[PDB]
Structure formats: structure tokens, C-alpha cells
Tab-separated table of N, CA and C and ligand atoms in Angstrom:
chain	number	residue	atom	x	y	z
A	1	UNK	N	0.834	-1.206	0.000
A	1	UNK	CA	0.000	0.000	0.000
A	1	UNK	C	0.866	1.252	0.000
A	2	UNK	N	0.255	2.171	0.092
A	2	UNK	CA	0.895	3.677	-0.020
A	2	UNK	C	0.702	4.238	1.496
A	3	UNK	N	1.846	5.213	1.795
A	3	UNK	CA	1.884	5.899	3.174
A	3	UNK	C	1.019	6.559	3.919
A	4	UNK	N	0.160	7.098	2.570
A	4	UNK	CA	-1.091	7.510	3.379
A	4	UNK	C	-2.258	6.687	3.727
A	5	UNK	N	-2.345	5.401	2.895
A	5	UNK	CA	-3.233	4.436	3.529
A	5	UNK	C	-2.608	3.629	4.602
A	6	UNK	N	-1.143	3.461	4.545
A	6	UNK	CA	-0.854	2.872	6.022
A	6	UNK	C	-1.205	3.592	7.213
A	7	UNK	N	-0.995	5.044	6.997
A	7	UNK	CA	-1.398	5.796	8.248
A	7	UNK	C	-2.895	6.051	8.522
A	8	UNK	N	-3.284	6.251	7.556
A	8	UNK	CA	-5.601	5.830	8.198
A	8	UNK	C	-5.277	4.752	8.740
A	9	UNK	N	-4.659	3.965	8.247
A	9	UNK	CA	-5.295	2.378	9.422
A	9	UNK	C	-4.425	2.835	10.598
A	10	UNK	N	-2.969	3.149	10.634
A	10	UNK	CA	-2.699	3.833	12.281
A	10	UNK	C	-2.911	4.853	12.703
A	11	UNK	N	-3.972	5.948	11.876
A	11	UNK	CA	-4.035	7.061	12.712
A	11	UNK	C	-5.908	7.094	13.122
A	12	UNK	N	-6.324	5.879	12.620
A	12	UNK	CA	-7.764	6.535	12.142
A	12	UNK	C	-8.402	7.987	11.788
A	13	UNK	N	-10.086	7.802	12.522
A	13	UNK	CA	-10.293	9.494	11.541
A	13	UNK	C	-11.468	9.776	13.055
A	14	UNK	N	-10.970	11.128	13.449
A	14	UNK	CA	-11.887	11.603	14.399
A	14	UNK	C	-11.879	13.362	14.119
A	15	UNK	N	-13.412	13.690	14.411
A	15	UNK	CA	-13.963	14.784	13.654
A	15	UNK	C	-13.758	15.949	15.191
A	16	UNK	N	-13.536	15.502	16.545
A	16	UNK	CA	-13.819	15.814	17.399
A	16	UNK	C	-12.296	16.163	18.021
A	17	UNK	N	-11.898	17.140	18.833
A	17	UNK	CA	-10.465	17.138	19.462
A	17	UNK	C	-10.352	15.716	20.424
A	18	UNK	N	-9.586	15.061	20.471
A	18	UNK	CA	-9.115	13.926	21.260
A	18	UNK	C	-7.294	13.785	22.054
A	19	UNK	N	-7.338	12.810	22.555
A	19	UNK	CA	-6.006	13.037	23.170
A	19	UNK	C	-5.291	11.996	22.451
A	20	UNK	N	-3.871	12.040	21.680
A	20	UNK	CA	-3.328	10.890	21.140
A	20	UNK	C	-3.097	9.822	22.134
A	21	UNK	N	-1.987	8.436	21.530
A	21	UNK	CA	-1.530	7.618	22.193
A	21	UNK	C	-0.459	7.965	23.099
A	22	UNK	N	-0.167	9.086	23.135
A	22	UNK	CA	1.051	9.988	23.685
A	22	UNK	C	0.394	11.092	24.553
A	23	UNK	N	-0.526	10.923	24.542
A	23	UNK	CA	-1.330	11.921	25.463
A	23	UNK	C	-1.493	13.803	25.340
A	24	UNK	N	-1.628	13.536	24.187
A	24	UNK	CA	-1.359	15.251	23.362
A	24	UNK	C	-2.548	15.291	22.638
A	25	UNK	N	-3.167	16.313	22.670
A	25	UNK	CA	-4.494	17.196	21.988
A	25	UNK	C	-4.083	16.584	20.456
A	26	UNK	N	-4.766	16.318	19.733
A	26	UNK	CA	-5.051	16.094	18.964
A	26	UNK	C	-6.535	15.525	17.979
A	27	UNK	N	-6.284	15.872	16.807
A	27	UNK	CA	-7.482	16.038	15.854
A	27	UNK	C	-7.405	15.520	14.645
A	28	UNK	N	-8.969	15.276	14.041
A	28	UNK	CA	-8.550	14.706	12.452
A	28	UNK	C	-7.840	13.405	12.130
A	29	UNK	N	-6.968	13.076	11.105
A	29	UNK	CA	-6.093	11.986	11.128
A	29	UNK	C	-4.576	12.162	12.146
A	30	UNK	N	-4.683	12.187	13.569
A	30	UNK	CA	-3.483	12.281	14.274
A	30	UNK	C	-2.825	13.301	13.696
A	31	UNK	N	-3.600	14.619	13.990
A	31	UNK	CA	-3.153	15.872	13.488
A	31	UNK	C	-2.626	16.457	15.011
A	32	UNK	N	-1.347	16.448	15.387
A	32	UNK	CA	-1.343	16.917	16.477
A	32	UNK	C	-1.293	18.296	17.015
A	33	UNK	N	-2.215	18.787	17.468
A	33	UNK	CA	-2.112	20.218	17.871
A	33	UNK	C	-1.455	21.046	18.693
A	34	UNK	N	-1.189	20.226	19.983
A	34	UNK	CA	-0.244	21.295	21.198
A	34	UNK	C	0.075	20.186	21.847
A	35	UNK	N	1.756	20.093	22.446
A	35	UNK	CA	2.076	19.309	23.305
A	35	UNK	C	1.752	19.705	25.107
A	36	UNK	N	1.014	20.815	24.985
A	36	UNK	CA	0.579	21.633	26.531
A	36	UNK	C	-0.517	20.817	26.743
A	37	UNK	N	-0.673	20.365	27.856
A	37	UNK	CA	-1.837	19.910	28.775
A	37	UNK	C	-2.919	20.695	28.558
A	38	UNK	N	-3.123	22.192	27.649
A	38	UNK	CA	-4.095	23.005	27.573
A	38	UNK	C	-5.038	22.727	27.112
A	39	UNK	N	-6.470	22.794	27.311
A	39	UNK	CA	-7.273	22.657	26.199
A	39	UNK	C	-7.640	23.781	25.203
A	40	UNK	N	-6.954	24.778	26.305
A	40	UNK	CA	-7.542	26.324	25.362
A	40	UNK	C	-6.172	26.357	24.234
A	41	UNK	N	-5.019	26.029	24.636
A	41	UNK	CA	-4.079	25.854	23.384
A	41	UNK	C	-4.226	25.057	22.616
A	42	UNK	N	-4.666	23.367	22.734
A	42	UNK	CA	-5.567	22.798	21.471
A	42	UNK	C	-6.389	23.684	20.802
A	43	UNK	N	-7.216	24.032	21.310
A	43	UNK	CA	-8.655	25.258	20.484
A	43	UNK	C	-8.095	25.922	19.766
A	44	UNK	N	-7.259	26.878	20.455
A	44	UNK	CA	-6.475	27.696	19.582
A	44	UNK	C	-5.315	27.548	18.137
A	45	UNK	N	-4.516	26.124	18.559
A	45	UNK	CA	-3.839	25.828	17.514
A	45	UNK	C	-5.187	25.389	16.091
A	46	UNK	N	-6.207	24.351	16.348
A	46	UNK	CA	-6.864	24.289	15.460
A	46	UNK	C	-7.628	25.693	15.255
A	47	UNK	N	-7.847	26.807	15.657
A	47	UNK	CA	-8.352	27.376	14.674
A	47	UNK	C	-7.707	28.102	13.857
A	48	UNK	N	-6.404	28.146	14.207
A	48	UNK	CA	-5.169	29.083	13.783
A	48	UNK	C	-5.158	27.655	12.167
A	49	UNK	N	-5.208	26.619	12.760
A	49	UNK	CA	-4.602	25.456	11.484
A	49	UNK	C	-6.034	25.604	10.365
A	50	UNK	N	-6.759	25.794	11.002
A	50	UNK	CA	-8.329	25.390	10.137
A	50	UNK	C	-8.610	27.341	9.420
A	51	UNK	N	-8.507	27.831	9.943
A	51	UNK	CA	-8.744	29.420	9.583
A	51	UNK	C	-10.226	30.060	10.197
A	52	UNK	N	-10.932	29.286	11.207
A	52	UNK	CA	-12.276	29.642	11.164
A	52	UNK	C	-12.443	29.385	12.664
A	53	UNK	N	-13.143	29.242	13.350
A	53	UNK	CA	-13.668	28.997	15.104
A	53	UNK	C	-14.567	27.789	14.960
A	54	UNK	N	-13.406	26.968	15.369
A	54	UNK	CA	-13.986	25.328	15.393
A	54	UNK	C	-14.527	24.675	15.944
A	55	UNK	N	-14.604	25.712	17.355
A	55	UNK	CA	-15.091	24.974	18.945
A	55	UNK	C	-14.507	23.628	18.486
A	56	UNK	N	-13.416	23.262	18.456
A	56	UNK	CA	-13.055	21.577	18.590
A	56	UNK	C	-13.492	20.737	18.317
A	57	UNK	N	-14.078	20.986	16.564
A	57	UNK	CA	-14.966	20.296	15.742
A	57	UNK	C	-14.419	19.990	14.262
A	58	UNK	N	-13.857	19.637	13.499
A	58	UNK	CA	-13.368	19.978	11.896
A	58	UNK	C	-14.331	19.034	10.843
A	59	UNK	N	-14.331	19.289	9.647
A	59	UNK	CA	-15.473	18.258	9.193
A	59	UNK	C	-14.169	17.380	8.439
A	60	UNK	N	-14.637	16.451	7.552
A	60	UNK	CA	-13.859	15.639	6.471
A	60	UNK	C	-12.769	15.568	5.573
A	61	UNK	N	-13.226	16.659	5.316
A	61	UNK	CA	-12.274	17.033	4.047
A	61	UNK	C	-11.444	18.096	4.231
A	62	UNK	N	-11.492	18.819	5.671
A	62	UNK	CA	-10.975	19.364	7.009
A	62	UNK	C	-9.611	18.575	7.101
A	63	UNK	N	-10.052	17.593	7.822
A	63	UNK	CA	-9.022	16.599	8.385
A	63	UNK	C	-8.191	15.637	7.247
A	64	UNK	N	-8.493	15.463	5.631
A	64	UNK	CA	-7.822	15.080	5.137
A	64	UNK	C	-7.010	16.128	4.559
A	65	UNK	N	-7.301	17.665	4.314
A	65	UNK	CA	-6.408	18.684	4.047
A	65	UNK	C	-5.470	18.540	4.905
A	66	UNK	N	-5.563	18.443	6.329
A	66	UNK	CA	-4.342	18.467	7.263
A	66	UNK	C	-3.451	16.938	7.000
A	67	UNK	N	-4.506	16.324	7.284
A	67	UNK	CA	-3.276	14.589	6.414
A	67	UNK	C	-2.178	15.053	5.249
A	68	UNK	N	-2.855	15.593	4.529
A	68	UNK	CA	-2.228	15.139	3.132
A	68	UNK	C	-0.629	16.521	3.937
A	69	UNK	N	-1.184	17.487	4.650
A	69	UNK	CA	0.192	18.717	4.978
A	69	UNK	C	0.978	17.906	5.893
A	70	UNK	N	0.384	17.109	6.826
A	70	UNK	CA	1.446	15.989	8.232
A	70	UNK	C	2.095	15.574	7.395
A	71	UNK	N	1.610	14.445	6.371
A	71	UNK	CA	2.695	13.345	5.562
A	71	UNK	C	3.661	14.340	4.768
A	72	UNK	N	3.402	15.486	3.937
A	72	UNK	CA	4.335	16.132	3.604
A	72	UNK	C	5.446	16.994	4.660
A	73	UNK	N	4.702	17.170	5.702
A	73	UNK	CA	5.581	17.737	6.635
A	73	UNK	C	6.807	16.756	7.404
A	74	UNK	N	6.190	15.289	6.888
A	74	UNK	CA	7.055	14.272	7.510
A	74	UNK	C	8.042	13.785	6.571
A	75	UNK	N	7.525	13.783	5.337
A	75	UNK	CA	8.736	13.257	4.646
A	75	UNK	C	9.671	14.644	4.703
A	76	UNK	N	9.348	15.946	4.258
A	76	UNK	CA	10.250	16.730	4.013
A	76	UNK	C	11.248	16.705	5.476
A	77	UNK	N	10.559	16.758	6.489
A	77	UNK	CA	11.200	16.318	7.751
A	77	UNK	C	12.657	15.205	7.644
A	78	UNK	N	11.995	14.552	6.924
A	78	UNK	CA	13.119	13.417	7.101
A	78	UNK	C	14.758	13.967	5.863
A	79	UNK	N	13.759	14.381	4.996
A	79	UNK	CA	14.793	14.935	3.886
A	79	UNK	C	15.679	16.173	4.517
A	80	UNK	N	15.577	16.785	5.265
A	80	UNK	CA	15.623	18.120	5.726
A	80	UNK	C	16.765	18.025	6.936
A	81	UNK	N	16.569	17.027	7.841
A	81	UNK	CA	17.290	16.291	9.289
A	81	UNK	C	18.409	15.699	8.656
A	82	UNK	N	19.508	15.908	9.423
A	82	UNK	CA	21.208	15.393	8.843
A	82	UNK	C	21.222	13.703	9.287
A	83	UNK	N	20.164	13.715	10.621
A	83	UNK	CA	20.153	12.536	11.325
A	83	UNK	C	19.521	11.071	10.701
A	84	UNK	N	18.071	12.170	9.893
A	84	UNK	CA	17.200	11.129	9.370
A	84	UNK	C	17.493	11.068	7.921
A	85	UNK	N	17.945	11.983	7.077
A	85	UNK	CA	18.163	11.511	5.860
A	85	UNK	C	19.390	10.844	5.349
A	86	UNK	N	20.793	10.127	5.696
A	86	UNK	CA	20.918	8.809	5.816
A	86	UNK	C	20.498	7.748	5.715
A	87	UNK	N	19.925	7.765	6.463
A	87	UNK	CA	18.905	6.787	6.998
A	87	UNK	C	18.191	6.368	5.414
A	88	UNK	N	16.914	7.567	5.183
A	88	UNK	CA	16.519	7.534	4.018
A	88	UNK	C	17.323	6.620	2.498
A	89	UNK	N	18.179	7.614	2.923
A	89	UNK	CA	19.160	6.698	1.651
A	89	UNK	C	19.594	5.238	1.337
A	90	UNK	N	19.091	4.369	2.601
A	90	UNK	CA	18.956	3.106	3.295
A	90	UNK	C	17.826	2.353	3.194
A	91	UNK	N	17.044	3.198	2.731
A	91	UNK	CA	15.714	2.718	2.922
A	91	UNK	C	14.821	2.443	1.671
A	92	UNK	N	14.460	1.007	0.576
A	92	UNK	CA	13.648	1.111	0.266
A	92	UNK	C	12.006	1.396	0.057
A	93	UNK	N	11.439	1.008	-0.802
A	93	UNK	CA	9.830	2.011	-0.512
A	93	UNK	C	8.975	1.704	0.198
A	94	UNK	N	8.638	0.459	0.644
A	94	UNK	CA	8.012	0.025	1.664
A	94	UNK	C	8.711	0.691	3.123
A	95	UNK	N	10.331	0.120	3.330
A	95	UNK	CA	10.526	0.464	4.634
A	95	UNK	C	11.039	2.234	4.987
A	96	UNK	N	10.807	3.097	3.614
A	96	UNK	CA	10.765	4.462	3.926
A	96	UNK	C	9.282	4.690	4.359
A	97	UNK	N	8.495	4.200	4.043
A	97	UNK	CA	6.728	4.448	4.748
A	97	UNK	C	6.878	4.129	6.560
A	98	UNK	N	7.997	2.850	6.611
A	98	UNK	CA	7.619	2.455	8.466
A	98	UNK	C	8.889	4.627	8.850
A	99	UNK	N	9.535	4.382	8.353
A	99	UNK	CA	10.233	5.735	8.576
A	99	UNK	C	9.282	6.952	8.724
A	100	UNK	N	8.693	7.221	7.875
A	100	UNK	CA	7.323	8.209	7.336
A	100	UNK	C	6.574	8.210	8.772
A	101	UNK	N	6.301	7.342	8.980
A	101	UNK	CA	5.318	6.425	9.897
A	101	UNK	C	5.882	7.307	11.378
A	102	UNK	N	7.028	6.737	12.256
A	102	UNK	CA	7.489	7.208	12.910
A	102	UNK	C	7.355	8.835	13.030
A	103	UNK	N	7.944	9.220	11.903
A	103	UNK	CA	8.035	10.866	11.863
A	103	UNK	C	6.952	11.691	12.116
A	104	UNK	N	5.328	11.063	11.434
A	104	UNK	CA	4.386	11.658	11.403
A	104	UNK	C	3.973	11.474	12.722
A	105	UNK	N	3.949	10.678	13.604
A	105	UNK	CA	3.384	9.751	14.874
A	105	UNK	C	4.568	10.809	16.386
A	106	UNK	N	5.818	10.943	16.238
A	106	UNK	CA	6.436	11.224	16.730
A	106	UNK	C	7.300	12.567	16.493
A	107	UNK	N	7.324	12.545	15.375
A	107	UNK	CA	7.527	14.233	15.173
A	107	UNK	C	9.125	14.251	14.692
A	108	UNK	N	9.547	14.951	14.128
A	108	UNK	CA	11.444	14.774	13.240
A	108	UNK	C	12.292	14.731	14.411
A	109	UNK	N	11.738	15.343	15.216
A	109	UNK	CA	12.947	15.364	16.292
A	109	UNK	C	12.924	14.141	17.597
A	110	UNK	N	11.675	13.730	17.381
A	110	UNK	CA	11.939	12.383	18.363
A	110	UNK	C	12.103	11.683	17.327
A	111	UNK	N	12.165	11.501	16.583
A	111	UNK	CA	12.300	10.242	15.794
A	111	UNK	C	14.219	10.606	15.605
A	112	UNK	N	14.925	11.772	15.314
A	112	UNK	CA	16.182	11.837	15.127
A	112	UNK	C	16.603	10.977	16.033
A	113	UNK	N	16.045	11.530	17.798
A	113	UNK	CA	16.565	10.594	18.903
A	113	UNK	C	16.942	9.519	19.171
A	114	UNK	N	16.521	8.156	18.037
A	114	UNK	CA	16.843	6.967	17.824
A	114	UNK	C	17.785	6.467	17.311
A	115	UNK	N	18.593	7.293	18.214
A	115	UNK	CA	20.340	6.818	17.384
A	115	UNK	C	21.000	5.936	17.149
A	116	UNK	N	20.883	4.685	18.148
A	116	UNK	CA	21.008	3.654	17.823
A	116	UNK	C	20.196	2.224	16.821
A	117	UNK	N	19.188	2.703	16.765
A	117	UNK	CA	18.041	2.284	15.921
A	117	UNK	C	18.660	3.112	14.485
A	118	UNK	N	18.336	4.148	14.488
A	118	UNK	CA	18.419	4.544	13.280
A	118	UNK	C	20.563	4.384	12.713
A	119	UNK	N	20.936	3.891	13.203
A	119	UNK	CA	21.919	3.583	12.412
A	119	UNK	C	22.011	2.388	12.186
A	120	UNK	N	21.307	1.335	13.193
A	120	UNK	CA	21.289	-0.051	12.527
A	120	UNK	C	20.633	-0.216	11.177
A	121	UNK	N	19.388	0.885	10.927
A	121	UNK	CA	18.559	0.975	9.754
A	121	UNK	C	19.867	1.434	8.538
A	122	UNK	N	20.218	2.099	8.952
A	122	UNK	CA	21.014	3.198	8.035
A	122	UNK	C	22.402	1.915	7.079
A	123	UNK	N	22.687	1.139	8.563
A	123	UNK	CA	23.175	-0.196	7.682
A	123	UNK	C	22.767	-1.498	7.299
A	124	UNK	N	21.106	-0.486	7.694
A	124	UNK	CA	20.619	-2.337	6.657
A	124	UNK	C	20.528	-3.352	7.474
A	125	UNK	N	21.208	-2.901	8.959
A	125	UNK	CA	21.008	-4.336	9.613
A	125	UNK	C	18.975	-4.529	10.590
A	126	UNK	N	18.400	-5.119	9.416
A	126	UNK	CA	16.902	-5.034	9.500
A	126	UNK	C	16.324	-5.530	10.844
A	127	UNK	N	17.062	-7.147	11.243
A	127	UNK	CA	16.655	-7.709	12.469
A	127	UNK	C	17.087	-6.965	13.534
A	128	UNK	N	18.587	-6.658	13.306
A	128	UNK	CA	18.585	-5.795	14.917
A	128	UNK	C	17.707	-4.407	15.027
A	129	UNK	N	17.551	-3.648	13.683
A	129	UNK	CA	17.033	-2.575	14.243
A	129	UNK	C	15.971	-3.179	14.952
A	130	UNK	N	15.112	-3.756	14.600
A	130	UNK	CA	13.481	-4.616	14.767
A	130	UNK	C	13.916	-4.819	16.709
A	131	UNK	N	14.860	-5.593	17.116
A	131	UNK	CA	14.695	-5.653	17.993
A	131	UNK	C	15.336	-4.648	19.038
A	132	UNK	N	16.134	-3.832	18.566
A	132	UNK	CA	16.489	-2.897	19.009
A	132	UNK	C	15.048	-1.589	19.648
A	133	UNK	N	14.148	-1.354	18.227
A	133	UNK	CA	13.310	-0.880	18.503
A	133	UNK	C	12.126	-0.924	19.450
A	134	UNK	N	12.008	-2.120	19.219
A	134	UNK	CA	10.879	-2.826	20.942
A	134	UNK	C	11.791	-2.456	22.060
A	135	UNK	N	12.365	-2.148	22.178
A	135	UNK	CA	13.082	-2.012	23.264
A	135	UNK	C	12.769	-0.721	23.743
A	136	UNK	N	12.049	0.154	22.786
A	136	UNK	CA	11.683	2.007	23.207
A	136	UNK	C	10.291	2.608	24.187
A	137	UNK	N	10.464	3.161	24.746
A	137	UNK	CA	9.141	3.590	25.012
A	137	UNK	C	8.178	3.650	24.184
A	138	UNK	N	8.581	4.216	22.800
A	138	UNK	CA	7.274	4.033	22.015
A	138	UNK	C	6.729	3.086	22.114
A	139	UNK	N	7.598	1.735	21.792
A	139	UNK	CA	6.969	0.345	22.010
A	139	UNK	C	5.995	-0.078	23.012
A	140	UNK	N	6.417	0.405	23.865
A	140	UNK	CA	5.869	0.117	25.305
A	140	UNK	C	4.832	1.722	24.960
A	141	UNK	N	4.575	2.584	24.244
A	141	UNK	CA	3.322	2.990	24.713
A	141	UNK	C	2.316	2.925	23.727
A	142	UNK	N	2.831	2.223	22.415
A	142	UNK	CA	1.912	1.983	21.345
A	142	UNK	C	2.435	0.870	20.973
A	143	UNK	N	1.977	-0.255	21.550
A	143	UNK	CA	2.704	-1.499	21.035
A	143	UNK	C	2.447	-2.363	19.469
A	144	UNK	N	0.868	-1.638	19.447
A	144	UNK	CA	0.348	-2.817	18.688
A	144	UNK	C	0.510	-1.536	17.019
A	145	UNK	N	0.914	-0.698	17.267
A	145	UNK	CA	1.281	0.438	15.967
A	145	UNK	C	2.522	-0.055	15.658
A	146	UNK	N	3.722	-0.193	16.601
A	146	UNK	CA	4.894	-0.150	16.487
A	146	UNK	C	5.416	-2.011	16.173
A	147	UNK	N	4.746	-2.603	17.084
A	147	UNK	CA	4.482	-3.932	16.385
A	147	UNK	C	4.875	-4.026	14.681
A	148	UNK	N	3.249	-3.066	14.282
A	148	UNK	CA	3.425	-2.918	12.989
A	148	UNK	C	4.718	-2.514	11.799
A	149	UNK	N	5.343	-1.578	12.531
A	149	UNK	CA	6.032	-0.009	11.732
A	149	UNK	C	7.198	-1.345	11.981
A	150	UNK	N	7.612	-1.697	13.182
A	150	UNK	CA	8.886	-2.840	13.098
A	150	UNK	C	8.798	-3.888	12.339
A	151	UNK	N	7.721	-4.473	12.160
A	151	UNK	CA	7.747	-5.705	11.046
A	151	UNK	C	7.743	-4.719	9.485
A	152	UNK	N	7.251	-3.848	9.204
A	152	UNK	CA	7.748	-2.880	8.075
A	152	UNK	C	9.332	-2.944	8.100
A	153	UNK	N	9.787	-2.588	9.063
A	153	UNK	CA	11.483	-1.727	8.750
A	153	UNK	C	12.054	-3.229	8.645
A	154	UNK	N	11.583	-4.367	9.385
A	154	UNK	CA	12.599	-5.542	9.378
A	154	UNK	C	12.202	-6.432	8.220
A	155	UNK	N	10.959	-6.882	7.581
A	155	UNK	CA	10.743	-7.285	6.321
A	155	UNK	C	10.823	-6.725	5.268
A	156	UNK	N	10.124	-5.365	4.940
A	156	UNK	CA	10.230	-4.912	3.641
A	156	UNK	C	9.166	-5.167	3.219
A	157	UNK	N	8.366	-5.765	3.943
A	157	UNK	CA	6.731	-6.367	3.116
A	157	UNK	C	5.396	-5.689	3.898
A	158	UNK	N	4.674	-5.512	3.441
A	158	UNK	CA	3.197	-4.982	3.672
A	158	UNK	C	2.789	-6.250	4.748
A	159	UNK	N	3.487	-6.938	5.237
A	159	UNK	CA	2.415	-7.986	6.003
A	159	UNK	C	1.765	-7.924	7.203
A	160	UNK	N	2.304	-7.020	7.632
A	160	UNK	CA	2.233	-6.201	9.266
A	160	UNK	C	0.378	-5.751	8.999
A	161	UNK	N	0.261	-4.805	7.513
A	161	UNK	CA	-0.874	-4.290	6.916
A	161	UNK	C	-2.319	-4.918	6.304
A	162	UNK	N	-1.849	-6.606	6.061
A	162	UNK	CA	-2.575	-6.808	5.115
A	162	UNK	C	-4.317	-7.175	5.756
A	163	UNK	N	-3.906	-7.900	6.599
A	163	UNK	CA	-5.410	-7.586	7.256
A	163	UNK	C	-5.667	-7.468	8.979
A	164	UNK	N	-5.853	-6.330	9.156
A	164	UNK	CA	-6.272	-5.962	10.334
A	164	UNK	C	-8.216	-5.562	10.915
B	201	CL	CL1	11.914	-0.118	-3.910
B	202	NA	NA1	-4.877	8.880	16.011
């Protein structure tokens, strides 16, 4: 599949402000809005993102405008980072999506943080990154996403995806 259908199945779709798996305001397809405990700074970032007074509401085609700007904000992220684009250069097309994946979910700069992970990727060595990576908090706070994104980076195959 393609990066943006891997991420609907890990980000789903909510029309309403919610709190991620990370415990941050967020909206839409895992559009994240403010890392502050605020709710009035959620409100505020979406109406600043949406252009209009949302009361903490967006409709459809709302929340896939912001998808389609995250995934671009994530790959350019990765292209952009000294840390993560290496890496990239390592990475065929399937296992640049579990990369994608990370970035959009965690943001360029936690994902740089995986220094030891991301250089096992960077040489290809697929199994250790895989188990290297369970080894993260992410793992331990989204297991059954990261489950996924690790059988991506260590196979190369959609199988993590094919039916859930
Ligand atoms: Cl390829
Ligand atoms: Na989500």
C-alpha cells in the first residue's frame, strides 16, 4: 500500500479534538495540535490550522487537508534532518513508509533521537534494528502500531498491513 493508507489504518479518523496515544491534543487523522496539557491551546492551535472557530470540531475534508500537509511535513522532515536523511538513503519504498510512519506519529525530532536504531537501519542491519526498537518507550506505549512499523522496517513487506 501507499503511506497515506498505512497511516488511516494507524491514525484513524476523528472529527472531534481527542487526546493521542502519547497523550497530546489532537485532531482529524493524528493531526497533532499542542504538546501543553491546555485545552484552550488545542482550540487555539486548530483554529489558527483550520482558519475559522472550530469549537473543537473539523469536518472531512478538514481533516484530510491536514493529512495530506502531516505526511508532507514528515517526509520533508526526514529529507531536511542530517540525522534522518541517511537513513533515508537506506531505505527502500516500503521500509521508507515504516520511517514516514514514525516521523508523522512522533515528530522529526523524536524520531532523530533513535540513534542507535536509526543507524542499525542506516546499515541495513533489519533484524537488529526490529529488535532494538521494541526495546523504546514508544513500544511500550503503542505497542500494537509499532508492532506494525517494526515488522515494516525488518521485512520490507506490507504484512504487518494486510489484514487488520
Ligand atoms: Cl523499492
Ligand atoms: Na490517532
Amino acid at each position: 500500500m501507499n503511506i497515506f493508507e498505512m497511516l488511516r489504518i494507524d491514525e484513524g479518523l476523528r472529527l472531534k479534538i481527542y487526546k493521542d496515544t502519547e497523550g497530546y491534543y489532537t485532531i482529524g487523522i493524528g493531526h497533532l495540535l499542542t504538546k501543553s496539557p491546555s485545552l484552550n491551546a488545542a482550540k487555539s492551535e486548530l483554529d489558527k490550522a483550520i482558519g475559522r472557530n472550530c469549537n473543537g470540531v473539523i469536518t472531512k475534508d478538514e481533516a484530510e487537508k491536514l493529512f495530506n500537509q502531516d505526511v508532507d511535513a514528515a517526509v520533508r522532515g526526514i529529507l531536511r534532518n542530517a540525522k534522518l536523511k541517511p537513513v533515508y538513503d537506506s531505505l527502500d519504498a516500503v521500509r521508507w513508509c515504516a520511517l514516514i510512519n514514525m516521523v508523522f506519529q512522533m515528530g522529526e525530532t523524536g524520531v532523530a533521537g533513535f540513534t542507535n536504531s536509526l543507524r542499525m537501519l542506516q546499515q541495513k542491519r533489519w533484524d537488529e534494528a526490529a529488535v532494538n526498537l521494541a526495546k523504546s518507550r514508544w513500544y511500550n506505549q503503542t505497542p500494537n502500531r509499532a508492532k506494525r512499523v517494526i515488522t515494516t522496517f525488518r521485512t520490507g513487506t506490507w504484512d504487518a498491513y494486510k489484514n487488520l
